[PDB]
Amino acid sequence: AGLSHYVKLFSFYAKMPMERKALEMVEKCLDKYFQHLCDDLEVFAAHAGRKTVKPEDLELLMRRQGLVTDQVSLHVLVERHLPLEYRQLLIPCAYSGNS
Amino acid sequence: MEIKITTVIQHVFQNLILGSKVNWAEDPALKEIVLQLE
Amino acid sequence: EILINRLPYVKISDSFWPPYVELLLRNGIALRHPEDPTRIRLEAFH
Amino acid sequence: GVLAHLERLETQ
Amino acid sequence: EEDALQMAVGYFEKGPIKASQNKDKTLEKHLKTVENVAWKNGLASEEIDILLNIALSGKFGNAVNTRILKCMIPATVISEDSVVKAVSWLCVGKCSGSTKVLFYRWLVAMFDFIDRKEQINLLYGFFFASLQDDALCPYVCHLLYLLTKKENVKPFRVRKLLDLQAKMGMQPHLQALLSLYKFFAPALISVIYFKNSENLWKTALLAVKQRNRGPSVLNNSLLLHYINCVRDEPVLLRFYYWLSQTLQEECIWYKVNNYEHGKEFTNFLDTIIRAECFLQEGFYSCEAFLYKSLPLWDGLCCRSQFLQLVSWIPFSSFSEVKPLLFDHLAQLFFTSTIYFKCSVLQSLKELLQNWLLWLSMDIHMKLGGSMNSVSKLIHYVGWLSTTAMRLESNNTFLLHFILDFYEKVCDIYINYNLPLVVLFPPGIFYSALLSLDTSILNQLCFIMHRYRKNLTAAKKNENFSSKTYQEFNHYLTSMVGCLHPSFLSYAVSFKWSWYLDYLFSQGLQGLKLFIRS
Amino acid sequence: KRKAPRGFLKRVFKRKKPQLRLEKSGDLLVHLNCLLFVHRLAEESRTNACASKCRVINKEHVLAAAKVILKKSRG
């Protein structure tokens, strides 16, 4: 499903043919990626003292992953990869009604 | 050097009365300013 | 628009009210610098 | 034509 | 009642579905049975596409349940597109992305019916900036593939399409849009194809078609007229160099296949032949390829095409074209069968007309040395056609084509205003006079009657007179005394005037034109 | 590929850890995290392929990629 979505997106992200036997191991890589993430969101949201995981709860985590910097903030990272109708939810546009 | 500004401000009317809360064509002022003739 | 008229890629050096700067970015009005994304260019409609 | 035809009585 | 019913649906929108005393799907379904007959008047389509889709009740099922059939009976008008671009406003209501997908599919499917497509084209960027969102790209790409004009190919849009191609996939819809943008101003270069998905809507859209029913230059015929009219230097040379390098490369292509390449070359030489029959002057690569490839030529290799190329050969001198070409259309004429022989005196028959046309207006556009060229061509054919008469023991088939050539030699003065009455060489005249069938005998009779007519016409306006009239009176007294074997065949199948009537009546029309003369 | 599954990421975030309150579009942030993680995977696996000059990504390059990037992507 979604792991199959990412391995297919791996094909258009690696720009280069790979093997299916590589894909079920990258599936375990995504499973462990969540096995680190969802308890990294767990511990980071607990660090903020909030039960829920707000967007800034993940901005700090992505700062940990070195992908958010003072040059590359959270929102700019949304520009480069997410589609428009999806970043319309994340980065606040303006209508005098900023999302 | 002026039409090149008139093809810039024009295309930021095709992109400002699009991305905002436009209510673009249900208005008689913009309807002649939007659909801006090339 | 003044900066693009004579060329610039900075043109705001990250102008403020971040809802606004990203406004003219999603609609295609302006473009982020592909390498240093704290500076903006107006999409070069020329 | 009678040239395209004359090429098919050469055969036939 | 639909206008009343649709305003009731609007009331169904000014209030909630729960507060309504009746179901929407009942009244909108009565409207749907109406759509199965006639879905939406231009004003009706406009309004019901406007209010049902901007923000109001318009359920992503209900607005879609209508949008599947919310197209137009007569035509879609500008005001339909106007404030549904304010449904494309794509905001707090937005007519959320699924109904957007059916909406852009609506426009793609009914792009053909708008009174002023230029108005929507003037709205190009409003849909082009809708290409960035992922869900509408496969349909917005189709729409802009249908909406694109040169005024909408500004370089920033080219760079936006390139950014979309880099960020997103190589999707064939983006490739199709890129193909259009390359077909226009090439600020981008790239090398599926209007394969639509509105086929499901094309149940209703095929009903809509039925409803509207009831309620470098050779393969361009529209551009061939330009080159027909410009005898300009850099275009007849831009075209000469293409023909020479297409008749060389693709004819060297024979030397590797000679069987399967012998069908596109034949079908390309057919296009050359048609282009010359239209444009009416021999392409200067058509002869230049002929002199180059006639000595190497066989009898039957593209005979039907090569011997129609010979017809369109720029009249040269018949002293500079004879050794180069006609010395080979005799080198193969005298060594090949009748079926190539008849294909040359026919080829040179058409060559005679294509030289005499260009000589008629050489009288129109204001001779003697040009005269000597057609006269010598006809004599050389008249030399060709006495020895071809000898090779095949007076074969009637070959002499039929010989006379078919001479059927266009009797009428030089009457037809082309050219004073070039060239009589038979006797090796054909009496060889058909004392022939054995009448479809060749009446042929000769028609030719000589047109010869009488043409000589009489030349006597009116004015060497021809002395020796030509002597030879024609020779062909007359000898033959008019002779006017017999095929006539004997008729007489066996058969009171002199009644014999005539039996003749005459039975197709002998060249004999009619003589006997009346 | 131009998609991002709303349902799948939420189902994974609920299956793996039963006690969270991921926000309205927080799963979209999780998708961005995985998108960039697989970006790093693709690029550093291309580097791994050029390391052994293999013209096809294989198991022995992905396993080396994992212990670098997956550990790096840990918060």
Domain annotation for chain F: domains and CATH numbers? 6-73 (1.10.20.10)
Cα dihedral angle (E141, E145, E147, E152), rounded to 10 degrees? 90
HEC string of E290-352? Answer: HHHHCCCCCCCCCHHHHHHHCCCCCCCCCCCCHHHHHCCCCCCCCCCCHHHHHHHHHHHHHHH
> How far is E371 from E420, CA to CA, in rounded Å?
7
> How far is E147 from E443, CA to CA, in rounded Å?
63
How many other β-carbons are positioned within 10 Å of the β-carbon of residue E99?
23
Kindly report the backbone phi and psi dihedral angles of residue E370, in degrees, each rounded to the nearest multiple of 5, phi listed first: -75, -35
Residue C40's H or E segment, with its range, is strand C40-41
CA E92 to chain centre: 55
Quick check: C26 and A76 CB within 8 A? no
Answer for the pair E355, D11: CB distance below 8 angstroms, yes or no: no
Q: Which residues contact E474 (CB under 8 A, 6 or more apart)?
A: none
**SS3 of residue C31 by DSSP:** strand
> How far is E484 from A30, CA to CA, in rounded Å?
105
> How far is E153 from E132, CA to CA, in rounded Å?
17
Burial class (CB in 10 A: 0-12, 13-18, 19+), E350: buried
Tokens of E413: 């003065």
- The region that residue E368 occupies, defined by phi over 0 for left and psi between -120 and 50 for alpha, beta otherwise, is left
Cα dihedral angle (E12, E15, E20, E24), rounded to 10 degrees? 30
Cα dihedral angle (E219, E220, E221, E222), rounded to 10 degrees? 180
HEC string of E343-360? Answer: HHHHHHHHHHHHHHHHHH
Answer for the pair F42, A29: CB distance below 8 angstroms, yes or no: no
CA E266 to chain centre: 17
Q: Which residues on adjacent β-strands are paired with residue C40?
A: C32
Tokens of A39: 């308890």
Q: How far is CA C30 from CA B24, C33, E126, E165, F75, in A?
A: 21, 10, 16, 19, 33
Kindly report the backbone phi and psi dihedral angles of residue C40, in degrees, each rounded to the nearest multiple of 5, phi listed first: -125, 150
CA E271 to chain centre: 9
Burial annotation F39-73 (CB, 10 A radius, 16+ → b, else e): bbbbebbbebbeeeeeeebbeebbebbbeebbeeb
Q: Which residues on adjacent β-strands are paired with residue C5?
A: none
Quick check: D9 and E339 CB within 8 A? yes
**SS3 of residue A16 by DSSP:** coil
Quick check: C44 and E159 CB within 8 A? yes
> How far is A59 from A47, CA to CA, in rounded Å?
13
Cα dihedral angle (E105, E111, E112, E117), rounded to 10 degrees? 180
SS3 content of chain D, % helix, strand, coil (to 5): 65, 0, 35
Pairing of strands A52-53, F21-22: parallel
Tally DSSP H helices, then E strands, for chain A.
Answer: 5, 1
Residue C17's H or E segment, with its range, is none
Cα dihedral angle (E244, E246, E251, E257), rounded to 10 degrees? 170
> How far is A35 from A1, CA to CA, in rounded Å?
18
Resolution value (Å, 1 decimal): 3.7
**Interface B:F, ≥3 CB–CB pairs < 8 Å:** no
> How far is E125 from E139, CA to CA, in rounded Å?
15
Task: Kindly state whether C26 is in contact with chain E, defined as any CB-CB distance less than 8 angstroms.
Answer: yes
Quick check: A92 and C25 CB within 8 A? no
* Alpha helices (H) in E15-53, listed in sequence order: 24-38, 42-50
Instruction: Count interface pairs B-E at CB distance under 8 A.
Output: 41
- The experimental method, as deposited, was cryo-EM
Q: How far is CA F22 from CA A40, A41, F26, in A?
A: 13, 9, 5
Q: Which residues contact B9 (CB under 8 A, 6 or more apart)?
A: C1
Answer for the pair C43, C32: CB distance below 8 angstroms, yes or no: no
Angle at E277 between CA E253 and CA E388, to 5 degrees: 75
Residue E434's H or E segment, with its range, is none
Answer for the pair E176, E145: CB distance below 8 angstroms, yes or no: yes
Residue A98's H or E segment, with its range, is none
**Interface D:A, ≥3 CB–CB pairs < 8 Å:** no
> How far is E419 from E409, CA to CA, in rounded Å?
11
Q: What is the DSSP letter of F2?
A: -
List, as own/partner pairs, every contact residues A45-51 make where C-beta atoms lie below 8 angstroms and the sequence separation is at least 24, other chains included: A45/F20, A51/F21
Quick check: C43 and E154 CB within 8 A? no
> How far is E325 from E289, CA to CA, in rounded Å?
11
Burial annotation E300-338 (CB, 10 A radius, 16+ → b, else e): bbbbbbbbbbbbbbebeebeebbebbbebbbebbeebeb
Q: Which of B24, A81, F29 is nearest to E91 (CA)?
A: B24
Q: Which of E296, E303, E238, E236 is nearest to E269 (CA)?
A: E303
Tokens of E97: 């992305």
Block residue for tokens 């999302």: A99
In this structure, is the dihedral angle defined by the CA atoms of residues E478, E483, E487 and E492, taken in order, positive or negative? Answer: negative
Q: How far is CA E458 from CA E200, E279, E385, E461, E463, in A?
A: 74, 31, 26, 5, 12
* Contact residues on chain A for C26, CB-CB shorter than 8 A: 84, 87-88, 91, 93
> How far is E363 from E333, CA to CA, in rounded Å?
33
**Interface C:D, ≥3 CB–CB pairs < 8 Å:** no
Alpha carbon distance, N-terminus to C-terminus of chain B:
16
> How far is E17 from E12, CA to CA, in rounded Å?
6
Residue C32's H or E segment, with its range, is strand C31-32
Q: Which residues contact E267 (CB under 8 A, 6 or more apart)?
A: none
Answer for the pair E194, E145: CB distance below 8 angstroms, yes or no: yes
> How far is E137 from E174, CA to CA, in rounded Å?
8
HEC string of E156-204? Answer: HHHHHHHHHHHHCCCCHHHHHHHHHHHHCCCCCCCCCCCCCCCCCHHHH
Answer for the pair E59, E20: CB distance below 8 angstroms, yes or no: no
Quick check: A96 and B21 CB within 8 A? yes
Q: Which residue of C has its CA nearest to B3?
A: C46
Answer for the pair A62, A68: CB distance below 8 angstroms, yes or no: yes
AA letter at E298: D
Q: Which residues contact E128 (CB under 8 A, 6 or more apart)?
A: E140, E144, E152, E157, E160
Which residues of chain E come before a gap where C and the next N are over 2.5 Å apart? 191, 215, 366, 462, 483, 494
How many other β-carbons are positioned within 10 Å of the β-carbon of residue E49?
26
Q: What is the Rg, in whole angstroms, of the alpha carbon atoms belonging to chain C?
A: 10
Q: Which residues on adjacent β-strands are paired with residue E76?
A: E114
Residue A52's H or E segment, with its range, is strand A52-53
